[PDB]
Symmetry: C3
Subunit: 367 residues, 3 copies
């Protein structure tokens, strides 16, 4: 009955991918000073099957301190967008997460730092030519820096898997893409302050100001949808593919800190950021990390370097200090199919105000 439903969906998906034509087009641009406004509600266009949004973000920042500079934080330009929230034409919320978490998922799905330029020995002048994602390492006292950042906000899982896409052929009922940008308070961290959400940190932080930020949203969708008597993958279009994040506190030295997957959700990936009191360490404050089921079954209890080794196989490098990734794409964590599962971190040292920022990528049935 469902075995048949599954097959029909996949076939409709296949026909839709074969007959419709992919389009990516600008839906809105705005230039502004976050000192004036930092939250914008973009109204996507209602056209065919929407797969996602590519959001271009640029900014000019000035360090007016008399003598001190500021330097990029570990997340840097990824913190230009503080949060993103999307609602479909039914006002059903899909993704709702931080710019840094969205960016880390973009990297994970690309298999390499998102839209980066790889360095090679080629004498031909390939390289960072176009500065697609870019930000100066430091901004000296009295200097102005230019930054460029891109985020892909997904609806559909991928280019070929339309699970999570949105049918937006629904006139009168619009979608909504909420972008909440960085501002002078969030973007600059004083020495000693927590740099988690900031773009720059340093002794010149107090006198740093955005001169402006601008964004351009491009909506990617499928046009010329195939018609029989309309071919649509009904499971695909009624599943939500979402990203979300949360914070957890309560870490104690040498004790297993467990974060339950309160599932029914099919978790494709998990990111755990160990914000150790504003301190971000390269695994030295952790004994091990693991994923486990009640049955004390640790399917992957690993020391930090070996955990990182698994990630190097996924994105060809390490995520920034204190950021840990876990891929469960092929076999998504689904609790009422494996029984309560949890993500575990056993800290070796815990600073005051220590916490785990959890980011999840998952599928779930709509309505």
């Amino acid at each position: 009955r469902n075995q048949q439903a599954m097959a029909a969906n996949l076939q409709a998906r296949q026909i839709v991918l074969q007959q419709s034509y992919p389009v990516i087009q600008q839906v809105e641009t705005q230039t502004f000073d976050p000192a004036n406004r930092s939250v914008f509600d973009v109204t996507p266009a209602n056209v065919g099957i929407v797969k996602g949004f590519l959001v271009k973000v640029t900014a000019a920042i000035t360090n007016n301190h008399a003598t001190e500079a500021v330097a990029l934080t570990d997340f840097g330009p990824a913190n230009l967008v503080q949060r993103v929230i999307y609602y479909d034409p039914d006002n059903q919320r899909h993704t709702e997460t931080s710019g840094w978490h969205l960016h880390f998922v973009n990297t994970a799905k690309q298999g390499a730092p998102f839209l980066s330029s790889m360095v090679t020995d080629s004498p031909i002048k390939y390289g960072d030519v176009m500065n697609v994602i870019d930000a100066p390492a430091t901004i000296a006292a009295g200097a102005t820096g230019e930054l460029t950042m891109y985020y892909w906000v997904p609806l559909a899982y991928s280019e070929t898997d339309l699970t999570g896409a949105v049918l937006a052929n629904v006139p009168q009922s619009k979608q909504r893409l909420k972008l909440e940008f960085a501002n002078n308070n969030t973007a600059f961290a004083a020495v000693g302050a927590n740099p988690l959400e900031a773009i720059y940190q340093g002794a010149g932080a107090a006198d740093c100001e955005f001169e402006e930020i601008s964004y351009t949203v491009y909506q990617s969708y499928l046009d010329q949808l195939p018609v029989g008597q309309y071919i649509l993958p009904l499971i695909d279009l009624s599943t939500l593919y979402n990203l979300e994040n949360s914070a957890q506190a309560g870490l104690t030295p040498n004790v297993d800190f467990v974060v339950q997957y309160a599932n029914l959700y099919r978790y494709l990936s998990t990111i755990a950021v160990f914000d150790n009191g504003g301190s971000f360490n390269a695994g030295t404050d952790i004994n091990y990390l693991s994923q486990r089921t009640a049955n004390f079954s640790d399917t992957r209890k690993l020391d930090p370097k070996t955990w990182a080794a698994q990630t190097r196989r996924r994105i060809a490098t390490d995520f920034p200090k204190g950021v840990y990734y876990c891929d469960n794409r092929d076999k998504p964590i689904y609790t009422l199919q494996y029984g309560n599962v949890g993500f575990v971190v056993n800290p070796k040292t815990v600073n005051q105000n220590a916490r785990l920022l959890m980011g999840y990528e998952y599928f779930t049935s709509r309505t």
Copy 2:
């Protein structure tokens, strides 16, 4: 009866499979030569007529001396990719396949590899991997009185890939030779004076007038399939594969005006897999700053990807893991080739922000087409 087609397709696929399973791949040298570009620079190579030919790997080396008393020269953006100026291939029936510039062929080699062709990636590995063998290499500058050594490789494709033989050539034994023509760089194309257009040059600088090749040398390796499988009906072969042309060609168009859409029409018949547009802004090559946007559209005013230069570059970063050189723009249509007939006329669009004198768009295309 459009079944005849889907029938022929299935048989072509079937045979391609059998041919790939049964035959055995060989790569062998067909010719090597060292010469002085002052004496000659155009060569016609006669490949061996054996089995099904997939392509040619062309190794080129050169020694260049900057004889200037005081000034240096530095690599242009294309650099060693300009060691071969033009490449043209003719099959045993004398039908032309690829006919393009060395730089265009190279950018396509890169596009198809998914990274700068034959480059050595840099990593944190303590083990001594790296640029050990200098496969594609050229000194960044050649000082006054110094001699630099360069190495460049080009893959001239007949077959689309190692597993897709569309475009491959049966070097039967028509007693009709194939021909691979190579027009190399020479002392008049390789060196650009300051202020001169660097497009086709290898080095540019104040010492350019006194630069010369000591020698250029090339080696052509032919890649083919041997031991072709025979059945009852005789030799089993994907006749659609073998009767299709997979070619690269380039062209030039002028007439750009600031803020006006400059449209290059795609021709009919051809199924365009990729498009490269080089904005030679009168000898100036800029990192997108002289362009408003680029697009692909249908006369039906429908742009399927009208994008600002940075967002266009972002798409390319997804394909080759980096940016192509300044002023070089890439467009991948591999999954759904541009085909005017299944879509109506289509054109590649560039709306320039600034246009210098003698501005032009150099177009490079990868496409499939029927022998008839």
Copy 3:
């Protein structure tokens, strides 16, 4: 064609197993020791489900107790922390038996990039070498102590999705044996002028370098909750009865400008070949070689190429070059099988041959038990 049945069946059982079992990676052993006391260890894997391989983590602290002279990493560096590996399955059949450097080069070939490396990019976001997964200081100055980390994957199964070579460790009696021979104070340090092939550091202070200590941790990767069907467990019988092994050998007798041929044996389906030209302790970037090739019985070469062009094919495989004097050959799609087409040999025609020259060969292959 009654074999198409068996194969068709094997492939189906493979998919069911992959689809139904759940992957586990777990520590089976950890140990710290002083190479001065012992350097050979026999690890005993857990006998659970289908075993795919072992991830071996190795850390070491090396002290250069020399008065004034430093030492610098050799081309292989930390890849020589493990000198050799040998694996015996529950039926006492050996699988891999090779050098640590050969195993490491195969790990790289299979990943398609230097194994567990961190690629450098222009990203402003701080990705990079954050965790030093495989790491070793370029030099250890007189009086200093350096910390190294190395990882090796010992394969049983060919890949995550191809279980050819995997081991059913339900077979209880007879434990499996994972034997590891580590570097020690005699193999890790080469004096200037000495052959650096097996060493980790080479230099004027080598004679006074020593291991402060070495430590290792073996993680076993396997499939659990095997699917049970009508007539019992659903298993890919062809996969589980095929051996996927890496092995090394050495050959000498090279003469300038003469083809040196190393014959491939029959029965084995060789997936890859690695040839290291240890030219009397000197390792050159192709300049001591005229060409390399793979040749058939009587016919000619199917790959006679100059060293740079040979290196070009490798660049398409691992996105970079292997260290000096190390040559790779991928035959994964059409394995070399002498039964398929007469004896085949690997050929190296050397340009210059030093005293004590030799080719150190490394092979990856499939064979039935």
